[PDB]
Amino acid sequence: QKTLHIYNWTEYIAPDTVANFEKETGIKVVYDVFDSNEVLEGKLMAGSTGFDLVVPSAYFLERQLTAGVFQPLDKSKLPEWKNLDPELLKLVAKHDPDNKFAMPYMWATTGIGYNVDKVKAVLGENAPVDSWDLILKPENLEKLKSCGVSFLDDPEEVFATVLNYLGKDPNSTKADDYTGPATDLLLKLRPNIRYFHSSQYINDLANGDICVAIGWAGSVWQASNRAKEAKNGVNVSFSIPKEGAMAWFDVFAMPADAKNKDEAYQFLNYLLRPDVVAHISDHVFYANANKAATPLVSAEVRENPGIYPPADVRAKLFTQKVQDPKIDRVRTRAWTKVKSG
Ligand SMILES: [Cl-]
């Protein structure tokens, strides 16, 4: 019997991807899901996970290439590797030099999801939906409070977004940037924020319970699609603001103790087939990292500049850099202070 154990995010594959793979290969796939990066990182560090393929962020990969948690990918077993977009390979390479350990899977940004009609009713037809001003100017958030404002419960992404908005290095290494101006702004915004949570805003956007949220692009586009299918009239959109936004990349990686490597390479090369990953993007509303696949993606998705942004927008995106542990503890303490009154 041939088997393959995969650990991926929830709602990060097409409903029939695994079934199609099993039919084509005769491999028994055990597909498990996690809903938070803390759960994944915890298992990876403990080792002996029993997984042949896992889906970490590229950022986490850099923090583990010296630890040897993953093994290098044999490109000779991945003949369709050439389909991957070289620009995205370069960005991932900043965490995984020479792309030795990770295969780029999907990527997106952290921007603003919003209810089109409610924002325009509160702030006017000319509401600054193309700017972080929509959600980071206190005067605007005070008006939007009643219709619901949510932020991610992710200090790393939120502080980097605030720092960039203030004109500072989004990956600032100065502790006082976090405890001072970044915290000062967040505390001015806090009384207008309904909650900090990294998933509840999907359904709340789709149902009309919140009007503006900091969120992951594909999660917001999923909310927009859920609202359409519900025929409730809720019109959700997403913005990569003009001041820039954090871009991030989820990748497939192979733990060093993977027990079914041959099956894992079959699955990776399966994902490299243009129609396979294009079909996933069609369902999850995330851009994949496969350049050959882009023309096969549904027009509604590939033509959406909030999913596949053009060159001018991509040049405004920043990626997360690793920090010294002191800065990590500073961000955690400051985040608790922001959230607690
Ligand atoms: Cl990343």
Author numbering: 29 to 369
Can I see the authors' text?
To gain insight into the evolution and designability of ligand binding and specificity, we analyzed the homologous PBPs, PotF and PotD, which are Escherichia coli putrescine (PUT)-binding protein and spermidine (SPD)-binding protein, respectively. They constitute the first elements of two separate multicomponent uptake systems (PotFGHI and PotABCD) to transport the cationic polyamines PUT and SPD across the cellular membrane. Still, the protein-binding modes differ: PotF shows affinity for PUT and SPD, whereas PotD exclusively binds SPD. Prior to this work, we grafted the seven differences in amino acids from PotD binding pocket onto PotF; this resulted in PotF_SPD, which will be referred to as PotF/D throughout this work to keep naming for mutants more concise.
